[PDB]
């Protein structure tokens, strides 16, 4: 008997690996929103 | 007479054993989702 | 005359005996599924 | 006959146990959001 | 003639008996989800 | 038959219990904002 | 012939019975959210 | 001549008799599943 | 010759009869879910 | 055949019934906000 | 030969019939939400 | 010579005759399942 | 088939109806502010 | 020799014939679900 | 073979039809808000 | 259906009611300023 | 639709009405100053 | 498809219509201030 | 069936109750501003 | 030998054919939602 | 295969079309505010 | 796309137009003051 | 509902009260100027 | 063996293709909102 | 001796052959579902 | 349920408390202006 | 992939374009105020 | 003896092979959704 | 069961703590404005 | 006598042997599903 | 195994790319507001 | 990332540039007042 | 059995960790707004 | 695991960086106002 | 947890720091006005 669930350990890892990519790159675009909003509020201020 | 259902006791155990692997490693990827979502909500916040 | 169906009484009993094994050990693996699913749903929740 | 659903009682308990972890630690991050938002509103105020 | 389906009456009863266990204990973990979600929504609220 | 949804009655109650905490303590910080704003307006006034 | 689906009539009723509990107690916690939000908006108002 | 198939009429009747037992008691356990599922869905709902 | 499949006509009818019971009573519990959900959404609304 | 969806007609009605309660009583608190704001603006005016 | 699937034509029709009930009455409660929300927004407006 | 297999022609016909009964009446109970399932899905829907 | 969205036509109308109330009565209080401000400026003038 | 499997050609055809009935009428009830869901989403929208 | 998805073409159309109703009538109430807000701002202006 | 926006009609009225108070009493103090200024100018005159 | 800005037409009119009062009565006191100044200059003259 | 934003064209127009009222009548009261101020300055002059 | 939205009637009432507190006490501080401003203008006057 | 799975090629094609209908017509109703939402947001905007 | 998202191209266009209406007509009312404010400031000036 | 800010060009122009009116007519009254003051000083002179 | 604008009635009164003080005491110093000026003119006279 | 998932490669591509349409055209309507809002803020400004 | 299981080799092959047909054509209809779902989610998105 | 808006009663009170400070001390500096102006006018007088 | 945010570049430009219009024409009316004020001060001067 | 499960090793591999296709191409369409949503949120932002 | 909302009690407290900082230090800068304005008015006075 | 069931021991072993192949390789394709689903959920998330 | 989330890296980048466009061009219009406001305040000044 | 706030540096500069214009030209008119006042005082002198 | 939700404890912590970063750095930019606003108000003051 | 919120640290910094630009350059224009106002007051003085 | 509002303490301080600059330097120019006015009054005196 057996069952090599070793290709899982690996394969799942890539899964996390890509979500860090999506997870990071995603944020990169929320900063543009962010800062562009501080500035927008600086100008309308004075 | 007899019937050695001892290879079961064992063999099934591996079954659980691998599901803890899938069961754990699976969660590892739900945290990436999770945290990447707190941060996403921190940035859009302020 | 006669017919010793006593080796049956016994032999069948083992039959039940092993099915409790399969029957129990089997469930042991449905809990791993179970709990690993509550947790999976806790994380995706918040 | 029988069926030892005692490994369930236990195993499920851990399930709750971990969800209190996820459940608590999760909130720990909603306070950071929270307070960081009161302050954000104090500054923009005056 | 006969057929003692009395060991059934009993044996099935345990079946229900254990499902109340699984049935209850299962819910115990859906409350943790539940409440942890009210609170999560209280904090993000104000 | 049965289903002890008594652990709910309780468990949910804590849920409300904590939201009164969050609910109160939250307000404690909206007063600081509040008063600090009356005063801010008193000074700029005269 | 027959089939006593009378234990259903009953057993299902409890089902509704408990959902009124969950159904009510659940709402009890949405009011805390609610009111705590009117007040939160009263203070930030003036 | 003859053939007393009267012990059949009877003996078969018990057969039905026991299947009503199995048939009923069996259902008793499908309600536990049932209700425990309505409640499970009430909690996850709100 | 013959074959009195008249006990079927009847016996099956009860079958439908009970499924209307299960079929109705079942729905009775989906309304509790339903309404308890409209209200839940009314409160969180305003 | 049949299916008494009459307990729905009723049960849903209560649903609306309670939302008028929440719906009305909710507004009662938006007037306090409202008027308390006209007055707040009368005083700061002159 | 044959197969009277005429009791279907009918029986299914009731099925639609009741879903128009649920389908309509359901909406009746989404208007209460709706309007109660326009008004809620009128008051907080001025 | 001969062999009157005419009592067959007939006798078999009844066989079909009863299976249309079982065959129809059987379906009558699959509609109850059916419709009771559309409705069940209408309610949980909205 | 169908769907009586006629209770909407009506129900929404009341919605507008009440907002004219809030909408009008609201203004009634902005005139008091208004005039009380012309007069306030007449007196401080001479 | 022979074997008139002509009563099949026919008899099976009815089989398809009725499944178009069940197949169509069945869908008639999935539209009610469908549309009643677009509308449900229109109202909750604005 | 076949499948009359013609009752769909129609039935869906009504779906759109009603959403134009909800869609229009809904807006009718956003104008009341709108105009009542221009006027509110005219008065507080001078 | 309904929505008793009658508690508004009333409640808003008080709003105006109090602003007449603030509105009047406010002026009472602008006369003191006023007259005290005519006199101040009479004396410095001759 | 509508918006009765008729209570304005009126209410504003009173506004003018009172300013004629303040406007007139105010002048009444500038004549006393005036004449009392001609006389003051007549006496100091000769 | 469609969307009758014709009730807007109209409804908004009234909005302007009333603001001309407020806009005009408002000025009517700034003239009283105005003239009453020329005269006030004529008298104090000589 | 049922749904005790009676704990709402009450709970919401407190909501209004506290907003009268915030609503009143808030004004208490706008008078200090107010009067302190009349006096400030009396002194700078003469 | 053989097996004319040619009536499949065809019959399945209709299957796709109807899903394009459902698939298209379905979208027709998501645009009404869509646009009616842009407009809803235009009005509440200014 | 296919998917006629051509009814979108169109339908969305109307969406823009109406927002130009709301968008323009909306401004028409901000000019009345505007000019009525220049004049208001001309009069109070001299 | 577009935005007809042409009704502005016009509407604003009237704004200037009326301020020339107020602007001129206003001066007409400062001459009366003026000349009436030269004469007042001629008489008191000799 | 309510709003105790009674603390205003009072609080404003003090406002007038103090302005009579400032208003009177202020004049006390304009007499010293006054008389000291009659005398100054008596002496330089003869 | 085989499986021509080539009709996927294609068919999915159209999927993206249409979402660029919806994706673009959608934005076209967010600019109208956008600009119409800059202008709205220019006018109310001066 | 012998046994020509050569008509099998062939005949089975057709079996696979047709399942590739069913297997492919089947998928063709899961893409329509698929894409029609991406688009459905694009529209409801913005 | 509850909501201790008692920390408000207090906290707001301090708010008034400090504004009396600012409110008083502020005036202390308007007297210096005041008197220093009577004297300035006494000296330039004679 | 793609996303033609080119209709933005353009559309926004018009936005600026119109604000220069409002921005300029607006000033045209502040000069009338301006000059009409120099002259007003020249006349009252001598 | 034997059993060439080698055509499996291969055949299954294609299975994975195609799911990477579906798996990838599928994502290609979730990015369009994604980005088109960042942009949608950038525009509505400022 | 449980939920340690104790890290909230604390964490929120810091929130208030920092707002007292911002709240105080903020005022420190409104005094500079204040006093620098009394003096500015003393000098321009005499 | 005898019976060499030794070719079984062996032959069956291969049976298990191949099922590990099918058993493993099968899973290899459930991971592709799995991961491709985490990622699908990451993208739609933010 | 694999999953080419490389088309993401790219595709998301464009997302940021366009938001810099919207982000910049957006600001271009807040300066027009800005400067047009300094000038507006220069003119009304002197 | 980035944000070209370079169009600001420039655009603001023009802002100052025009205020020097308004700032200078404005003064040009205060000299006319000035000198015309020295002369006015020379003539009335002797 | 088991389930190592230890990688959560950790992973979530980073989540908070980064939100303190976003949470702090975010505020750093609200001070620039803040102070730049005190100064802006100092200059326009005198 | 991880999440590189390092592109934030940076990106936000630029945000502050640009607000110092807007923040400074903005003030540059409040001085022109300022000084141009001292001078304006010097000339009108003598 | 935490929140370093230490960069505030500092940053705000500079805010005061610069206002002392503006606050002082501003006065420097009110003395020039002042003295230049004493002298102006000395000369016109004798």
Curated annotation (Swiss-Prot), chains A, B, C, D, E, F, G, H, I, J, K, L, M, N, O, P, Q, R, S, T, U, V, W, X, Y, Z, AA, AB, AC, AD, AE, AF, AG, AH, AI:
All ranges on the Cytoplasmic side of the membrane: 43-46
Topology relative to the membrane: Single-pass type I membrane protein
UniProt KW Membrane keyword: yes
Tree of life domain: Viruses
Transmembrane portions of the chain: 22-42
Record topology, Periplasmic segments: 1-21
Predominant subcellular localization, coarse grouping: virion
Keyword Hydrolase: no
This protein's UniProt keywords: Capsid protein, Helical capsid protein, Host membrane, Membrane, Signal, Transmembrane, Transmembrane helix, Virion
Subcellular location: Virion; Host membrane
GO cellular component: helical viral capsid; host cell membrane; membrane
Subunit structure: Homomultimerizes. There are several thousands of this protein in the phage capsid.
Cited function: Self assembles to form a helical capsid wrapping up the viral genomic DNA. The capsid displays a filamentous structure with a length of 760-1950 nm and a width of 6-8 nm. The virion assembly and budding take place at the host inner membrane.
Family, as annotated: Belongs to the inovirus capsid protein family.
Protein name per its UniProtKB record: Capsid protein G8P
Gene expressing this chain: VIII
Full protein segment contained here: 37 to 82 of 82
